Amino acid sequence: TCPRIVSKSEWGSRATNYNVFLSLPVPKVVIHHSAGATCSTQSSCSLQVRNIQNYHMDGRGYSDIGYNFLVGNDGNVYEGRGWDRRGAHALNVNTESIGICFMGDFTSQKPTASAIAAAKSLISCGVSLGKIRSGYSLYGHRDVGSTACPGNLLYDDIKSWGRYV
């Protein structure tokens, strides 16, 4: 029931050495969006992940891509920092959350149903592993921190997801 996850090596992540850990199991799950390009192919989504990684490391000086996981409109999940490591994404809920980023801009378009589905089964996977508390809370990125955002179709959707807060 876990979704197939494209590992770092499978999307060609470059070599990192970020080794700051979350205290498992994690209470919160935050949902983000790249506010960028979408992608419908595994190879084209893989490129996008690499582009984002490079932006974060070369552009912003992060020690790795900032999100724990990314989701493509191809329906796939891509590993970033993964289950055990701490994001740079959301402040200061980085310290106790998994960040899941949908690759796209969702102000006038909705993510693909398979992209939505992969995220949910990813969350369910983490719970079943005990990476995430069974009674987790779910937030959009605007919910958690003091950041303004425009009307967004992704964040409308996550309201109907279980455990939304």
Residue numbers in the entry: 1 to 165
Q: Paper's wording?
A:
PGNs are normally recognized, and/or hydrolyzed (amidases EC 3.5.1.28) in some cases, by a class of PRRs, termed peptidoglycan recognition proteins (PGRPs). The catalytic PGRPs possess the amidase activity that hydrolyzes the amide bond between the MurNAc and L-alanine moieties of PGN, via a coordinated Zn2+ ion. The full-length BbtPGRP3 consists of an N-terminal signal peptide (Met1−Ala18), followed by a CBD (Gln19−Tyr71) and a C-terminal PGRP domain (Thr90−Gly255), which are connected via an 18-residue linker from residues Ser72 to Gly89. All together, the modular evolution via gene horizontal transfer and domain shuffling results in a unique domain organization of BbtPGRP3, which has a higher amidase activity and a broader spectrum against invading bacteria.
The PGRP domain shows a typical PGN-binding domain scaffold, in which six β-strands (β4~9) compose a central β-sheet surrounded by five α-helices (α2~6) and a short 310 helix η1. The two disulfide bonds (Cys91-Cys214 and Cys128-Cys134) further stabilize the PGRP domain. Multiple-sequence alignment showed that BbtPGRP3 possess a highly conserved Gly-Tyr motif (Gly150-Tyr151) and an arginine residue Arg170, which are featured in the Group II PGRPs. Using HADDOCK server, we docked tracheal cytotoxin (TCT, GlcNAc-MurNAc(1,6-anhydro)-L-Ala-γ-D-Glu-meso-Dap-D-Ala) and muramyl pentapeptide (MPP, MurNAc-L-Ala-D-isoGln-L-Lys-D-Ala-D-Ala), which represent the DAP-type and Lys-type PGNs respectively, to the active-site valley of PGRP domain. The side-chain carboxylate of DAP forms a bidentate salt bridge with the guanidinium group of the conserved Arg170 docked TCT-complexed model, whereas residues Gly150 and Tyr151 interact with the side chain of L-Lys via van der Waals interactions in the MPP-complexed model. Moreover, structural comparison suggested that the complementary electropotential between DAP and Arg170 makes DAP-type PGN a favored substrate. Compared to the individual PGRP domain, fusion of the CBD resulted in an approximately 500% augmentation of activity towards S. aureus PGNs, compared to a 50% increase towards E. coli PGNs. It indicated that CBD contributes to the hydrolytic activity towards PGNs (especially the Lys-type) of the PGRP domain.
